[model samples]
Target: MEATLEQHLEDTMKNPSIVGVLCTDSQGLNLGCRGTLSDEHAGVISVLAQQAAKLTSDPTDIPVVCLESDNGNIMIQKHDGITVAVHKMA
Candidate 1:
């Protein structure tokens, strides 16, 4: 049996510091999310992940994109063609 994306998300978000998680497809389609994360947040992060990699000429697959707000931290990652945005408290 294979674990679903939600299972992985659920396991990761067991930490108290973690606030939310957003998952999406390569085409910016929302697969699923937990906590207070919004579709807008996931879309923007997905676009940012696509654009951030073009910021530099260095040969890298994709950079670990992060955005820190006054209240929390937003971590963006792309793996297996899936874009996941993890929101955690500061």
Candidate 2:
């Protein structure tokens, strides 16, 4: 396991409200996943992050997409070719 990345996941998952966490490459390929987050959705998460960035006029801008539902919430962002998604219980 990657110590740093594993540590990060551990730390983030420590949050009581957090349901899951996922990390993916620019291509939406799953790099890592934990908790209730499924690796299968990595592609869609990456694609959503990339598509949301287009909402801004600046091509260099990074976008964060947050979605809230009755039962849960989801947050997605892309940075330095890496996409991360966090799922939280409502």
Candidate 3:
């Protein structure tokens, strides 16, 4: 079975330190996001959205997206045509 947006969001929030969680398509477009990750970061969403459009065929095509906060890093993984996992710095 595929994971739903709610399931992904809940998992992202499980990390208390994670201030935000953004899930983009394989094209890098912002399909869905949660928390305060983009609160003060102006244009961040726009940039991600653009990237997503360039990278994915559909918003749900993102395979996996992960980010780390200790050093401020974002990672993305793409599979056949769907998102599998998204995690933050542990």
Q: Write the per-residue lDDT of candidate 2 for residues 1-90, one digit (tens) a residue.
A: 445777888899999999899998878888888997887888888888878877897667787899889869899987567888999997
Lowest summed lDDT over 10 consecutive residues: which window, candidate 1? 52-61
Per-candidate alpha-carbon RMSD to the true structure = 1.7, 2.4, 6.6
Off by over 4 Å in 2: 1-3
Candidate 3 residue lDDT tens string, 1-90: 898876877777887765566554444455666765443332343454345546667656643334457645554444444332333444
Q: Is candidate 2 or candidate 3 better by lDDT?
A: 2
- State the TM-score for model 2: 0.85
Deviation from truth (RMSD, Å), model 1: 1.7
Clashes of each: 0, 0, 10
> Whose lDDT is higher: candidate 1's or candidate 3's?
1
In candidate 1, what are the lDDT values of residues 1-90, reduced to their tens digit? Answer: 888987998897898888899888766788888887877776787787878777767665578889888978888888788888889987
> What are the runs in model 1 whose C-alpha is more than 4 Å off?
56-60
